[PDB]
Amino acid sequence: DNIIMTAYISIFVQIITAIISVYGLFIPLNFKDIILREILILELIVQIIEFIFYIWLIITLQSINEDITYVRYFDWVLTTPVMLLTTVYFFEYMNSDDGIRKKEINDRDYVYLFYICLSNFFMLLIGYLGETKQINKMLTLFGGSFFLFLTFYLLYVKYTKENWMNYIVFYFMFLVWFLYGFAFMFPFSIKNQMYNILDIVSKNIYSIFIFIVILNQSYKLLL
Prior knowledge:
Elements: H1 2-24, H2 34-60, H3 72-95, H4 102-131, H5 137-159, H6 164-183, H7 188-222
Helix pairs in contact: 1-2, 1-7, 2-3, 2-7, 3-4, 4-5, 5-6, 6-7
């Protein structure tokens, strides 16, 4: 019953986060802060895919007859590249001397951003092969972890600066994504409970963070 309970907890946070995010879109922004709204729009698009998966899950769990963990990959293969792009946009926001927008970043860096998303795709493909038992768990863990490390290395060396604001955002995200790999080791129920709660942290906490940064930047404009 704890897969269902953790799914409901995840859905609860998704709904409240979506409401917060929509109000966030309409907060007026100073010039330098425009990219924060570009990030929040993409986080809301991630939420649409996440929500469709979670409604599918709670309906499916009524009559589970097979191990449905692999179905998460149809969400992740869409959401995780968008989340890596929004992370790049947020690092560029933090670290850039004057105003920066996603078009400037995309137009400049599309090849490198492709590399990041291709590394991430290989991580997911290896996970999917392990989840569907087309390769053994040990090969899945080692190959998946290799591409997780490559993704986060490529992100670090291009987009971070050496300060504690950067270390918090980078290492929080790295640890949370690593813990999806940790979950892979566990039996059906425990693994799926872990994913249900991890999604709150990887997706919804990120949205709430961006909302609070917008509110902080814009508070004086609002009042």
